[PDB]
Amino acid sequence: SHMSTEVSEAQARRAVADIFNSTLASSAIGAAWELGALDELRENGKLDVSDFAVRHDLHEPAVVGMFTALASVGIVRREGATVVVGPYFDEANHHRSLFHWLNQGSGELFRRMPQVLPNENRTGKFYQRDAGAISYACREISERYFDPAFWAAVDGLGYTPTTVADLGSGSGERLIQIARRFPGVRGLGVDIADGAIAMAEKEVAAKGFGDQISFVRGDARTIDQVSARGEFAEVDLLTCFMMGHEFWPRENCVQTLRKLRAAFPNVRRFLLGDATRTVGIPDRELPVFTLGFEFGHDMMGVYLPTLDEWDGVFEEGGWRCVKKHAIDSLSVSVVFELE
Amino acid sequence: VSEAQARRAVADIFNSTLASSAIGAAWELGALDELRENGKLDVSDFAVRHDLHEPAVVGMFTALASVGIVRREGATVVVGPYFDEANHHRSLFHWLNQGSGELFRRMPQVLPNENRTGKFYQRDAGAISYACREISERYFDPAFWAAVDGLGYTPTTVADLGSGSGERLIQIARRFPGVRGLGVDIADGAIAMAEKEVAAKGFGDQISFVRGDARTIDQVSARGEFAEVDLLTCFMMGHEFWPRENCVQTLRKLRAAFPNVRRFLLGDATRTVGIPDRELPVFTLGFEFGHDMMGVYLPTLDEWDGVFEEGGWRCVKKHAIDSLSVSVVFELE
Numbered sequence: 001s002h003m004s005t006e007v008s009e010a011q012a013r014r015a016v017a018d019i020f021n022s023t024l025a026s027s028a029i030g031a032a033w034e035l036g037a038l039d040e041l042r043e044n045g046k047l048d049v050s051d052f053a054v055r056h057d058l059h060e061p062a063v064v065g066m067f068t069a070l071a072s073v074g075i076v077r078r079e080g081a082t083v084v085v086g087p088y089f090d091e092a093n094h095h096r097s098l099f100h101w102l103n104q105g106s107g108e109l110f111r112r113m114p115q116v117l118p119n120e121n122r123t124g125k126f127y128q129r130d131a132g133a134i135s136y137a138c139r140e141i142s143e144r145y146f147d148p149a150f151w152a153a154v155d156g157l158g159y160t161p162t163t164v165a166d167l168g169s170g171s172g173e174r175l176i177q178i179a180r181r182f183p184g185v186r187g188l189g190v191d192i193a194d195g196a197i198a199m200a201e202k203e204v205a206a207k208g209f210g211d212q213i214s215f216v217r218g219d220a221r222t223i224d225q226v227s228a229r230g231e232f233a234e235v236d237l238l239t240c241f242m243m244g245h246e247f248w249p250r251e252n253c254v255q256t257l258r259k260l261r262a263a264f265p266n267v268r269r270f271l272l273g274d275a276t277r278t279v280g281i282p283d284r285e286l287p288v289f290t291l292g293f294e295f296g297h298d299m300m301g302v303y304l305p306t307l308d309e310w311d312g313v314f315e316e317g318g319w320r321c322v323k324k325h326a327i328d329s330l331s332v333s334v335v336f337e338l339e
Numbered sequence: 340v341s342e343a344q345a346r347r348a349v350a351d352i353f354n355s356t357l358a359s360s361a362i363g364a365a366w367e368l369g370a371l372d373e374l375r376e377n378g379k380l381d382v383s384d385f386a387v388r389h390d391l392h393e394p395a396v397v398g399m400f401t402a403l404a405s406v407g408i409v410r411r412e413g414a415t416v417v418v419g420p421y422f423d424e425a426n427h428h429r430s431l432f433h434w435l436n437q438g439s440g441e442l443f444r445r446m447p448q449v450l451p452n453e454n455r456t457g458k459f460y461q462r463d464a465g466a467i468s469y470a471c472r473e474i475s476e477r478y479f480d481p482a483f484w485a486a487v488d489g490l491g492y493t494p495t496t497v498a499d500l501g502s503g504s505g506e507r508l509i510q511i512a513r514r515f516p517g518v519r520g521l522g523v524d525i526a527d528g529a530i531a532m533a534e535k536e537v538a539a540k541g542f543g544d545q546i547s548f549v550r551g552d553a554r555t556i557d558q559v560s561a562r563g564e565f566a567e568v569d570l571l572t573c574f575m576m577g578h579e580f581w582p583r584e585n586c587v588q589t590l591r592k593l594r595a596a597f598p599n600v601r602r603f604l605l606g607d608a609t610r611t612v613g614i615p616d617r618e619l620p621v622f623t624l625g626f627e628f629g630h631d632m633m634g635v636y637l638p639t640l641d642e643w644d645g646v647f648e649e650g651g652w653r654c655v656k657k658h659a660i661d662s663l664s665v666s667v668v669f670e671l672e
């Protein structure tokens with residue numbers, strides 16, 4: 001019953017106030033996640049606002065504001081000094097990392113809409129985001145939304161991997177988790193960014209896998225002009241999560257996929273996971289994330305393929321898709337099992 | 340609630356975030372005015388005239404559409420059921436997002452006490468000022484002009500505290516062609532903008548500016564001009580005088596620095612008390628949470644009513660403001 005064109009003034013007032021307040025609630029979800037408040041609420045059902053501020057050493061008036069913001073749209077409820085879970089708590093907390101991504105991660109982009117849309121401004125580095133914050137969010141995005149399909153694909157491999165390469169390795173956690181599952185395995189993380197490599201190297205060394213897992217800074221799109229090509233022949237498992245859209249547009253993807261197939265000639269399975277562009281969902285029925293993901297990429301000047309466009313590119317790129325998993329639901333996102 | 344209702348509500352909160360930034364942007368880019376005027380627009384046409392990246396332009400319009408502010412029929416965009424309300428309050432959205440977005444984005448870093456020394460938050464001064472012009476004009480002007488009309492005299496020299504763009508002083512000089520104007524602002528940027536705008540409009544011989552902190556108004560030098568001032572105005576910054584003890588002193592210093600002021604017009608939003616969380620009108624939560632985050636005391640209306648006398652002033656008229664949280668204009672003597 002959602003799409004009315006005629007409403008009363010009172011209704012229009014309430015709706016616009018909700019849109020306003022939703023903005024603050026939205027930012028609060030990620031902030032409350034980061035400050036530990038969503039985990040307290042989830043675990044205990046309630047908490048005490050002063051007691052929370054004191055234990056975490058937080059400016060109490062702003063803590064009250066954070067919780068009021070959440071309460072303004074029904075995520076929590078305030079009752080005296082107490083905050084209890086509200087009707088939408090479970091759902092909001094489920095998707096907290098998407099909110100964090102939207103706000104803490106990509107806030108500066110969407111805030112700068114007026115300066116980002118003008119063509120005269122769209123050269124070189126024209127927007128800013130928070131890499132540390134995006135990295136914070138993506139860990140849970142990876143774990144909450146992609147892991148079941150990822151591990152289901154790893155379980156149906158039909159062989160034990162001995163050397164695994166991961167494209168866009170980020171924190172290096174995927175490679176670490178792999179090493180945990182397959183004790184004897186070696187790992188190769190490829191990433192185009194210095195912070196990622198360093199962060200990943202540190203974590204790897206700290207968790208005791210400095211002997212099994214290494215890294216190389218490189219562009220996966222131009223993987224054939226990298227300085228670690230001699231190690232590639234040993235790789236029998238390839239993984240690539242949350243970055244496949246960077247290989248687009250179509251013709252670049254085709255080439256990149258060919259290059260990957262030639263560069264990793266002994267890879268058996270290649271597990272490829274990403275979010276994709278949706279078509280024809282009504283404006284008033286967009287689920288969580290979809291709009292942020294698509295509008296964010298349009299603002300950054302980055303093309304996002306549909307699922308159908310991935311489907312249609314694998315054969316030319318040298319790969320056969322033998323299984324596909326739908327993700328629930330991070331917009332329309334999937335894991336392809338390629339060989 | 341059912342699980343479907345919860346999904347839908349959380350999706351609305353997410354998309355609302357995007358619609359919310361888009362209101363302010365659509366304002367700046369001229370899309371809201373064009374929609375007010377014609378009732379519709381063409382996404383291609385608009386993108387081409389404004390030389391904008393069209394796929395991002397469609398995004399902006401689908402954000403607005405996602406919550407009922409507009410509706411899309413292919414490339415045609417028509418005003419939606421919530422257009423008039425949102426357009427009305429567009430400056431508030433702009434303020435929250437383009438002005439103050441970076442403060443609320445950094446919530447996790449701003450709340451911890453160890454982080455709250457020195458320059459611990461950032462806002463966009465240019466953007467805030469952009470919004471503030473319309474906030475002042477749309478929300479405060481009617482009460483401001485009503486107070487001017489009922490002053491009981493015609494001013495000769497007006498001083499404006501936190502003068503910003505200089506617009507309020509310009510408009511007063513338009514109403515009272517013989518008036519001398521003086522603007523006090525703490526920001527060099529405001530002083531520069533105001534001097535430029537005044538000089539450009541032809542009022543450079545009538546309106547001057549001095550950089551100064553209105554809280555310590557007694558410490559700003561102005562060639563003895565303060566003593567000639569017979570009308571004082573201060574909009575949208577009075578809460579900066581607080582807490583109470585500081586306000587009492589600043590009020591007493593203003594009284595002393597401006598001995599010949601007859602009326603002092605003091606306009607501001609205030610902290611509300613007891614509004615139910617799910618019934619919060621537009622702005623209230625942003626205004627109050629923003630200042631709580633910034634460490635800035637915000638008084639209630641009653642706190643203001645209770646401070647004037649000890650501050651050396653008598654309140655003689657009060658005006659309610661329409662639909663800007665709880666906002667008022669006091670007239671003081």
Ligand SMILES: Nc1ncnc2c1ncn2[C@@H]1O[C@H](CSCC[C@H](N)C(=O)O)[C@@H](O)[C@H]1O
Binds near residue numbers: 169171218242243246
């Ligand atoms: N063309 C490219 N080649 C290699 N790495 C890339 C790339 N484009 C982006 N990346 C890297 O891919 C990452 C995107 S998000 C990382 C999430 C990570 N894959 C995970 O599953 O947890 C960033 O670390 C970025 O540096």
Ligand SMILES: Nc1ncnc2c1ncn2[C@@H]1O[C@H](CSCC[C@H](N)C(=O)O)[C@@H](O)[C@H]1O
Binds near residue numbers: 502553576
């Ligand atoms: N303590 C202080 N003393 C003087 N000016 C101040 C101040 N605190 C803030 N300001 C200035 O007050 C302005 C707040 S915005 C209000 C603009 C103006 N009064 C109007 O009605 O449109 C900014 O220009 C800011 O620099």
Ligand SMILES: C[C@@H](C(=O)C(=O)O)c1ccccc1
Binds near residue numbers: 138141242274275
């Ligand atoms: C990492 C992120 C992304 O592409 C981005 O932030 O630009 C992403 C990719 C895929 C699913 C979810 C988030």
Ligand SMILES: C[C@@H](C(=O)C(=O)O)c1ccccc1
Binds near residue numbers: 467474576607608
């Ligand atoms: C300028 C703003 C404010 O207090 C702030 O930006 O800190 C304000 C004050 C009063 C009404 C509306 C906005």
Ligand SMILES: O=C(O)[C@H](O)Cc1ccccc1
Binds near residue numbers: 311321322336
């Ligand atoms: O065409 C597809 O849908 C997928 O890209 C891969 C696939 C093909 C056939 C059977 C399963 C998976």
Ligand SMILES: O=C(O)[C@H](O)Cc1ccccc1
Binds near residue numbers: 655657669
């Ligand atoms: O106490 C008040 O309400 C205001 O401070 C101003 C006022 C007082 C008395 C008569 C009129 C106005």
Ligand SMILES: [Ca+2]
Binds near residue numbers: 002
């Ligand atoms: Ca409806």
Ligand SMILES: [Ca+2]
Binds near residue numbers: 308311
């Ligand atoms: Ca298909």
Ligand SMILES: [Ca+2]
Binds near residue numbers: 418419420424
């Ligand atoms: Ca309307």
Ligand SMILES: [Ca+2]
Binds near residue numbers: 469470472473
């Ligand atoms: Ca303006």
Ligand SMILES: [Ca+2]
Binds near residue numbers: 560561562565
């Ligand atoms: Ca003086």
Ligand SMILES: [Fe+3]
Binds near residue numbers: 245297
């Ligand atoms: Fe991306």
Ligand SMILES: [Fe+3]
Binds near residue numbers: 576578630635
């Ligand atoms: Fe303020």
